[PDB]
Every structure is written in structure tokens, then in C-alpha cells.
Design a protein around this nucleic acid. Structure first.
Ligand code: SAM
Length: 246
DNA sequence: TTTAAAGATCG
DNA sequence: ACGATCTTTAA
């Protein structure tokens, strides 16, 4: 199982096996919520259309793809014992928020992701990364995961856009896998959740297979009503895999 | 400026 | 989800 080089929400490693079993075959894979791209790294499609609303994430992916060796060498400098402390961390965080260079920001972004608290990615309304120091014993430098991402990225396009705009890139050769932010058990609104389901029903009308993963609640069961539902056993909340087969 | 509730900040 | 301390919002 290929691991992403980033700490990210919805890694979904345990249920990667369930995704592949319910994900149809096609020429191209479309991911509106690529995130860490665990599905992308653990599937084998000819082409990939990978999208996310996070511009720092998308910019990082483009840098890693086009400038792999240059990036790895520069980023590896950050992962040494001297940079594993609060004072250095907050200066690099400040440098990141003030940097105008995409390459430099991409380098610092990996450092912040690995040395920051819980591997979180949080911004204020000023667009500034404000995750505190994580204080780990020894953050891991994902060199192998980086090179593996770069090689697989050669068959992928990265776009920074909302799900509605990325799913419209899908055609008949396409297969769409959606991994939206989790639905409430008691940002991403409820309207966007239902809208995603409606867009899915639109694609399946044009003979485009769509697979959506989410929590198994009352709202999600209602939203994905027109889909072939599968429940995976993970309060005790299970996950739901909604399949819109043409 | 006042006021109260709400939202935002960031360790 | 936490919490003290900011800013925001509307009459
Ligand atoms: C919970 S993560 C899942 C990522 C991915 N499935 C993985 O394996 O890491 C969902 C991602 O969707 C992106 N996202 C959030 N809201 C979005 C929106 N309204 N439109 C498009 N993408 C969005 C976020 O940047 C986030 O990284």
C-alpha cells in the first residue's frame, strides 16, 4: 500500500481495499478531492485528473512533478535535527506566509506539514498558515514517497478548483471518485453535500461512473439514494460507499 | 462610543 | 473538540 508523502485528513488507508473493489474501470480517473492522493497512489489508471480547493496543495504537487530532483534536494535540508524546535519552526512558518516564490513555499509546506501539530493544515481569514509547532521526536522525510509521487504524476493533471468544475472534466472514458469532507455526526456545508450527489446523478446520466465515500448517517443515505450503496464496518459510525453505475 | 452575541485567533 | 483574547456584527 503506497503511502502519501503528506500527513493529511482522509487518508483512508484502511478502506482503500473497499474503494478499489467498488471503483469501476476506465481510462481516466477524476478526483475532485484529491487531498493526499492515497487513491491516486494506489490505483492504476492511464490518466488522472486530480483536483482540490487548496492552492498550496496543488502548487506543491505541480512543483514536485516538474522539478522533482531540485525540490527533494532543497526540502531535505529542512529535515535535520537543528530545525526540530519551536523558534525555528515559527520563523519558517513566517517565511512561508511571506514568501512569493512557489518553489520556496512548496519546500516549506512539506516541513510545516511534518513538523506541525497533528499534521494539520489550518489558515486564518488572512490566508496565513497558523498551525503551532508539533514537537515530534524525529519527523520523517518522505523521500521515497516523493519520488514515487513524481513518477505517477507524469500521467496526472493537477487543478485548483471546486468539485463542480473538476467533475465537468469527466468524459465517457472517465471514472469519478469523490471523497468530500465528512458529513456531520451531530467549511463544507450541507448544501454542497447534496449538490455533490446531484452532480453525481448528472454524470451517471451521461454514462459516467461515480463513486462517493462518506459516513453512514441518515443524511448520507438520503443524499445517495439513487446509488448502489455498500456499507463497510469500521458512537460507532461506519463508512458508506455510494456507487452510481451507468 | 454602547451593547450583546457571535465569530475568529492560535497555541 | 479546547480556551483565553482578540475582532466582527447589528441595532
Ligand atoms: C477530507 S480530504 C480527503 C482527501 C483525499 N480523499 C485523501 O485521500 O487524502 C477532502 C479534500 O477536499 C478538498 N475540499 C474541501 N472543500 C472542497 C470544495 N468545496 N470543493 C473542492 N474540494 C474541496 C480539501 O482541500 C480536502 O483536502
Amino acid at each position: 500500500k503506497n503511502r502519501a508523502f503528506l500527513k493529511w485528513a482522509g487518508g483512508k488507508y484502511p478502506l482503500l481495499d473497499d474503494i478499489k473493489r467498488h471503483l469501476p474501470k476506465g481510462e481516466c480517473l477524476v478526483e475532485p478531492f484529491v487531498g493526499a492522493g492515497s487513491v491516486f497512489l494506489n490505483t492504476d489508471f492511464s490518466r488522472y485528473i486530480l483536483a482540490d480547493i487548496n492552492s498550496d496543495l496543488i502548487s506543491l504537487y505541480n512543483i514536485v512533478k516538474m522539478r522533482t530532483d531540485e525540490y527533494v534536494q532543497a526540502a531535505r535540508e529542512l529535515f535535520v535535527p537543528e530545525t526540530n524546535c519551536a523558534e525555528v519552526y515559527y520563523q519558517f512558518r513566517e517565511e512561508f506566509n511571506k514568501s512569493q516564490d512557489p518553489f520556496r513555499r512548496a519546500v516549506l509546506f512539506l516541513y510545516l506539514n511534518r513538523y506541525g501539530y497533528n499534521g494539520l493544515c489550518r489558515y486564518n481569514l488572512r490566508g496565513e498558515f497558523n498551525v503551532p509547532f508539533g514537537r515530534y521526536k524525529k519527523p520523517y522525510f518522505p523521500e521515497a514517497e516523493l519520488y514515487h509521487f513524481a513518477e505517477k504524476a507524469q500521467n496526472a493533471f493537477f487543478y485548483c478548483e471546486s468539485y463542480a468544475d473538476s467533475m465537468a472534466r469527466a468524459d465517457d472514458s472517465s471514472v469519478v471518485y469523490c471523497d468530500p469532507p465528512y458529513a456531520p455526526l451531530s467549511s463544507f456545508t450541507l448544501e454542497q453535500q447534496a449538490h455533490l450527489a446531484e452532480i453525481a446523478e448528472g454524470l451517471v446520466e451521461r454514462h459516467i461512473p461515480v463513486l462517493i465515500s462518506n459516513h453512514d448517517t441518515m443524511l448520507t443515505r438520503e443524499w445517495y439514494q439513487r446509488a448502489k450503496l455498500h456499507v463497510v464496518k469500521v458512537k460507532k459510525v461506519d463508512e458508506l460507499l455510494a456507487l452510481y453505475k451507468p
